[PDB]
Amino acid sequence: GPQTLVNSLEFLNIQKNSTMSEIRDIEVEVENLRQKKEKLLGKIANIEQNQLMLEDNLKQIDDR
Amino acid sequence: GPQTLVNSLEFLNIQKNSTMSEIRDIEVEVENLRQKKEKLLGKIANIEQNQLMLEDNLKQIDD
């Protein structure tokens, strides 16, 4: 009967909630990767800023 | 002195490049997860295209 099609709906619907939840898992990985990247850019920032407190000293001594 | 300073800048720079490398690595990983999410969002649509039809079919039946 037509209960078969209603059955297929609620199945598709189940599959959809499942697909959604996998999408949400993905959004989490992405966010957590996005932060790791931000930390890493902090490192660079500091490296560069440390480097320039050196390049300072070098070209100050480069005429002593 | 200038050697110490040159040795130091260079070392830091090794670190920099090697850090910019993990950054390129994350960026690839993130690209992949985006393409994965794009496909999954496609599939959400396929699911609903299908459901709509089944639902209309069930209405047609009501007549």
Phi, psi of A62 (to 5 degrees): -80, 15
Are the C-beta atoms of residues A36 and B12 closer than 8 Å to each other?
Answer: no
Is some CB atom of chain B closer than 8 A to the CB atom of A62?
A: yes
DSSP structural state of residue B63: -
Environment class of A10 (CB within 10 Å of its CB; exposed 0-12, middle 13-18, buried 19+): exposed
- Experimental approach was X-ray
User: What sign has the CA pseudo-torsion A36, A18, A15, B49?
Assistant: negative
Q: Which of A14, A29, A63 to mutate to test the interface with B (most CBs of B within 10 A)?
A: A29
In angstroms, how far is the first alpha carbon of chain A from the final one?
Answer: 96
Residue ranges of domains in chain A: 1-64
Q: Report DSSP state, residue A64.
A: -
Resolution, rounded to a tenth of an Å?
A: 2.7
CB pairs under 8 A between A and B: 84
Give the residue carrying structure tokens 């609903």. B48
From chain A, pick out residues whose CB is under 8 angstroms from the CB of B6.
58
Q: Cα separations (Å) of B23 from A38, A47, B17, B56, B59?
A: 9, 15, 10, 50, 54
Q: Does domain B1-63 have CATH number 1.20.5.170?
A: yes
C-beta atoms surrounding A59 within 10 Å: 11
The residue behind tokens 């890493």 is A40
- Asked if residues A15 and B47 have their Cβ atoms less than 8 Å apart, the reply is yes
Q: What CATH number matches the domain at A1-64, 1.10.1760.20, 2.40.50.140, 3.30.300.280, 1.20.5.170?
A: 1.20.5.170
Q: One-letter amino acid identity for B12?
A: L
